[PDB]
Write a protein that binds this ligand. Sequence first.
Ligand code: HEM
Length: 182
Amino acid sequence: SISISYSTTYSGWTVADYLADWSAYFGDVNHRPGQVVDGSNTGGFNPGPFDGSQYALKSTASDAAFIAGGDLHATLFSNPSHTLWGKLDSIALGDTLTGGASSGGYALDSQEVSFSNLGLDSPIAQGRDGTVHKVVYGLMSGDSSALQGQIDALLKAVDPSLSINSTFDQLAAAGVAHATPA
Ligand code: HEM
């Protein structure tokens, strides 16, 4: 089932409130036609250049950053263009991104929260409608709505009383979350 890791700082927050705040602060990197600037708002893959086990992106305006983990593929100019697809197992949120292809991976110097065992798989044919794409492109664009909806479904699948409106501590009591040090 979904497995959540959270710094004790966030023990009393709901998942929805945490994500709404995190993404609003991360802010839209404007990865859109006319506005993509390589090395600024593309993020990167490990091993890359356009596929790998991690995709990571920091904000254009601060150190906030996320890492998507799984078996990921960006089509870039190939049909269906500008689709991220594959298998998405995890999302880690925090700040101070480090690493990259030259390091053999990415890590956050301050990981706040992670969501693992997401079990998302999106075929290339779904294009930009796939859940993997929506989750990650949403985060790139400062919008955690898609991620929230996937977490909500995973939580309900454990028990319908659990949701994105549960606190991290409630989710820990319910067996789906664990705390890390503040
Ligand atoms: C190495 C990382 C990436 C590079 C170098 C890259 C590069 C680009 C470029 C060059 C464009 C076209 C800009 C233009 O039309 O002027 C673009 C657009 C786009 N990319 Fe990426 N991208 C990357 C990662 C991603 C990821 C991970 C996603 C999805 C989660 C994504 C989704 C899109 C979308 C949706 C568009 C806009 C398409 C449209 O509205 O027509 N990209 N990207």
